[PDB]
Amino acid sequence: NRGTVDFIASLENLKEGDLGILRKLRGARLDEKLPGFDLFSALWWPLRQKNQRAPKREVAWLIAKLFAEFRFEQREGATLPILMGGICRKLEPKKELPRVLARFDQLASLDIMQMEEPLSVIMGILRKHQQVCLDWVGLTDVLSFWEQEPVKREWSDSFIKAYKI
Amino acid sequence: MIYLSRLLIDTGGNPDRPRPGRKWLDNIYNVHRRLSMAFPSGLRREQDPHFLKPFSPNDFQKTPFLFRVDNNIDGNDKRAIIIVQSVLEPDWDYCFQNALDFLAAPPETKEYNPEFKAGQLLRFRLRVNASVRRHIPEMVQQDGQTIETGKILHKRVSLTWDASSTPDQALADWLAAKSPKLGFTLQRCELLQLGWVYGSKPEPKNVKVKEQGQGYWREHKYNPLRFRAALLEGVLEVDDPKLFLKTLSSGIGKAKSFGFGLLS
Amino acid sequence: MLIEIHMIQNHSPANLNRDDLGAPKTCYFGGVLRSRISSQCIKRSIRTSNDFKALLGGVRTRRLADLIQQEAGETECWKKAQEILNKCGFKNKDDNTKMLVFMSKDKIKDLARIVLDNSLGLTEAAQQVANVIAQATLAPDIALCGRMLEPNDKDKDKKVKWSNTTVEAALQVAHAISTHIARPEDFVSMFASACFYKYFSIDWEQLVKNLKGDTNLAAHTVGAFLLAAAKTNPSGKHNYPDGILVEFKNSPISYANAFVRPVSVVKESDLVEQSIGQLSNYVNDIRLGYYDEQSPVIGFWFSPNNRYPLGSKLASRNIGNLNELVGAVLDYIGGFKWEEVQKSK
Amino acid sequence: MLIEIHMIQNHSPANLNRDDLGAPKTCYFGGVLRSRISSQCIKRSIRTSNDFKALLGGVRTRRLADLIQQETECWKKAQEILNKCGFKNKDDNTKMLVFMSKDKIKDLARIVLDNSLGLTEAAQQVANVIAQATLAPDIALCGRMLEPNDKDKDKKVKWSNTTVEAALQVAHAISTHIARPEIDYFVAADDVPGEDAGAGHIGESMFASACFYKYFSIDWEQLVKNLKGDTNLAAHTVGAFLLAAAKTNPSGKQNSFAAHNYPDGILVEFKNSPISYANAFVRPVSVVKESDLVEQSIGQLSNYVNDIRLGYYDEQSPVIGFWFSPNNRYPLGYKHSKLASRNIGNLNELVGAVLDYIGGFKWEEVQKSKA
Amino acid sequence: PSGKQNSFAAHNYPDGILVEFKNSPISYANAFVRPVSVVKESDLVEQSIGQLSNYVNDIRLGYYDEQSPVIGFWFSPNNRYPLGYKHSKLASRNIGNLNELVGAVLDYIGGFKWEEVQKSK
Amino acid sequence: MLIEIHMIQNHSPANLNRDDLGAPKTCYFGGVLRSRISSQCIKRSIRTSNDFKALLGGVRTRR
16 A cells, blocks of 8 residues: 555654654553644644545554554564464463463454553563564554454464474 | 623644634634534523534524724733623623633623713723725736726725825824714823734535425535734723713724724 | 944833833843843834934835836726736735745836836746845845745746845844842732843945945944934833943953842932943953963943943043944944944945 | 852843754753753853863764875774774764874874784773873863774673763753743845845844853862862863853854853852752842842852751851852842851952962962863 | 653652551551642642641551551651641650661661661671 | 552653653553653652762662
């Protein structure tokens, strides 16, 4: 898509104070603080009048909050079920692998709003394994259509494919 | 029946935050509107206390009344003063019940009744328009080559005073001569403020029509209105305490709705 | 050197500076409210005064196109000049340009004779317009008040180049404050002459640098500045100053803190002379705490025929005249008798 | 022997420090709003002051290799060398802040004009000479983060660490009372006549007036360690800091306001552990009808100074204090005791007392060590 | 702490130190569950110390009166902030100096002074 | 036998326990945002203190 790329690139332009106030708004809707809504409006309004396709609003808000909290860099080919699974091969299959594996499968049966904390723990173990790159555009357009089961099964089969290799 | 009171409004101090009262004071049509939906009615008072209803000016009582916006220092704080008085009781618990940002301190109602008899030295200021009907509305000077085309139009243009004097002895002569009509006099008069005041009033029209009823489909229009201001004081001696009360109930000049009212 | 003038003046606030709500301008000093007149109001009132009639050489306009056909004589040069100005970079919403242009009233004919030539294109015409308004600083008003000029870049042609188009201001006027409590108006010769304190500072070297090195023009500027400040009420349309203290130093010092506590006095006539007493007390302690050797400070005191005195020795001399005051400020720069300095614009 | 400066200074209505929105800078302290004169603004105002002329020379540089020709057309190869040193190029300048500072630009000029050498060794000796410049006492009062950008060269930049552990700590200036913001209204007043009333521009400006309590925290030992000795030079920079703290103000919007308000009282101390009497003005100063707010603020300050002097006692650590007022216009010992060791009336012997307690130096020979 | 003290010099001293001697631990942090709203008649430090004294007296009367009493010393510098305006004599000794509070703690400890203890190392 | 210390301070405008972004550390206590000075920071400033430069008997080094 040619609309989400501008959103991710504009997010990468954000300076320290803006993503600090985005960091402070974890688990909080974009209403109880005025500056957070102002920042989201500035990020989210001008990309609908230049390109016809835009992500969903809740996906954009959640992705902005998570991006502020973790601060990765955008790189093609680094979606969640590849780096996930790649880290699962670096594990003991007896005990820890079912633990981390269940932590990953918790994402596949959740709605967009409640995934903030499971995505937080998944990206926390990603940060523990020193992962710098994450395809924010790829994550965003597989998350804006997260409610159709073909993309969920494709994401899971990507995890399988990265695990068997 | 004087109901003199005060409405101390919240001027800001940051022209970065939105300032509702400062923006509200810049348009005298909406200033009159704000001062006039107070004491609204008892017709639908028992229905809702929350001021959440579609507005219509017909439900509001159409009693003419007065106000004036001024500025003063109490002892240590600049705060613009609005002085109002009316024949109906004050009930500003509904006009500002969801616009508390317009206010700075809660408003206070006073009781006052006048007595001056004749020839004392305890009087006060005045506000009026410098409006006169034109002696020579000269034939509508049009444009294109700076020419004159039209016939006539009786307009309430601003007062064209003399050219060899200043208006603290020209307008002073004007209201000194005007005073024996209204039942008082001026022994001294010095002007404080003069200039223009501006506003905007909307005109509902009708051009388009609707295919199943009458022409509900229609457009908007705005029009400007201007007035010439004069705020001034004087140490005055009332001729009689029997006809000056009518002047204290109508005011010298009758802008009324648009600020210029009675002596205060 | 810096020319720091402190004046105590009884200005009636009935016809004085107003804000957008009609109130007189007020400021909080010492935690308590005082009366204020704005610095730009004093600057403009001095500018458009009777004594500054010869020295008003700068025009702060938005319609150069209107000024083009005032000495051109011919009729059909109004829209081409607008196009050339737009190609320079000053955009047009109407007859006026939408940024403020500050030039001297002698290069407008230069712009007219540039515009009326029809032997060259619009690009180099706009470049020549920039050559006109990029160094046209030949005005004492420009030298005193200061200016920078920068144009819009959104659809301006990219083939234009501007010089260092800013001139640094020579004038630091303080917002003049009322020493006493501002009198209340209520809810039940006619208004008092408020004792005001004003502060003016002129940088001599920077001003003569801003006038391309002239000396008699700048001397006329400073003399007419003192005369216009003393004689003109700051407003728009004699009241002589009770005391003028004009001090020369190389650093700015503000004597506003002399009136941190207000001079709360019941008697009307017993206000200004002990306002001057408070000023003398604080000038004494500031001199005794700050000005010791190194760079000494010399100041002159003026009153209407020496009516309110000063203090011991905190000034240099007492003179009860205004043109003598001009002659006494202008001789410390060295010479420049005032009877010949007016032969400049 | 910590150099701690507590000052009292009332300001005329002005706007010295402003953000991008034009509002004067404000902070919260004790739950109430105070006027803030930011630390960096005070550092630059004392740095760019008239008296900080003999010891200046910590020159800011982002546009590099243009002064090299000022001291041949070295825009090509010297900028190429700088890029090979890590400071990459993004425009007609270097997109990296360089604190090269010291007046040893002769060394950089002579290595750049030396057309008998390559890139790697010249860039290396540049790396040791810019990490060991160590002049310009503003470096010793504010350090560097010049650690290039390791996305260039063949990775042969084995530099030395440039961090200097600067000895200065400056608190943001604190008003002793409630800050009162004010609005200024100005018009442009079109000079040539028109058919309108005439106003070429309309704007709103801000200003404020406050009594300011300032806190400068320097320690002598790190200051003299960062300055490789030169005791008279240390006395010169502390004297320049005292004179600049006493004589200059931030030059923001001062062409329109002129708030050159000099000092009310000065607290210069020398102790072994740092303290701030901002907590004196946790209670805001309210004006009483009998006294001015400078006298009131000095009384509150004296109350809290006596608190800390008596309630924090160790017999092995005696602490002195100096008090200054212009001609003793506001003595600190109004309430109960002579709190300061000596009450000083003029600035010059206040600097003399600072010199005497620091090293016994005088104000005449201290200017000989220009350095 | 030594954070951005170069640009924010906030070296300040504590105006209240409370030392208690129990065989079980407590933390008087539930006093400041309500944030201190600064009023025009008092200061933030005095109000916080008053809330702390309220909580300390309350916990002392609620979680005590054993056979073993709770003994403590209260420290304010030169006694500008005594323990509120509530019930007095709550602390066993209101001490105005820091070294005397340290000496009182050390004398409770078993009778070791402050000077010869430093001779250990 | 437990020896307990309870203290109350008040500092100037400060950045004592900033973020890697630069934001001073915050925590929620009672549902309202409170500034937090880290326990590790308090302990280290205690350990590195001037009056703790008469007690030190360990370094806790890396290499």
